[PDB]
Amino acid sequence: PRGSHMSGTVLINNINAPFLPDPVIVTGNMTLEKNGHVILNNSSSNVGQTYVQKGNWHGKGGILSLGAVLGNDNSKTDRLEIAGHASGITYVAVTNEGGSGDKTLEGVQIISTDSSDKNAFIQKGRIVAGSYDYRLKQGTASGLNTNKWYLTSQMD
To answer: Which cysteines in this chain are paired by disulphide bridges?
Structure first.
């Protein structure tokens, strides 16, 4: 598709200003190529990075790597925010950054889109904190906000 194409690895790592990192905002449409990596988890002291694409997002099987202090719905987490439509396939890896684990109600919001195709994001690897296993879902546990993507937990 038209717009930018990312095949490398980009690391997102802004410093708390003063409590939370400034989002990195990129204009236009983005295609994340198969060997592409967008990595937000580069510092456990600055969890809460945000990558914002002011346009559409097309995945060709690249990877988004996020960190989260995994607990309940209010977990501190890195996030991807897409102003437009998400299509294709982007894999999502999430690393626990000192979370204890907890049961979610509706889920931890990690990705927001204007709209997403089915399986636009696909989990890669297990996501575990304490005795809880986390899974990627389009929309919340109860089916709300299906343009957003969540992590829901269950006892492991």
So the answer is: none
Angstrom distance (rounded) from CA 48 to CA 103? 20
Stated in angstroms to one decimal place, the resolution of this structure is 2.0
One-letter amino acid at 75 equals: S
Q: CA 19 → CA 39, 47, 70, 76, 93, distances in Å?
A: 20, 10, 18, 12, 24
Beta strand pairing call for 30-32 and 57-68: parallel
Q: Work out whether strand 148-155 and strand 108-112 pair parallel, antiparallel, or are unpaired.
A: antiparallel
What is the total count of domains within the chain? 1
Give the CA diameter of the chain.
44
Q: How far apart are CA 61 and CA 53, in angstroms?
A: 17
Elucidation method: X-ray
CB 121 within 8 A of CB 92: yes
Name the residue with tokens 């003063």.
Answer: 18
CA distance 93 to 79: 12
d(Cα 85, Cα 35) in Å, to the nearest integer? 21
CA distance readout (Å), 128 to 98, 134, 139: 11, 6, 20
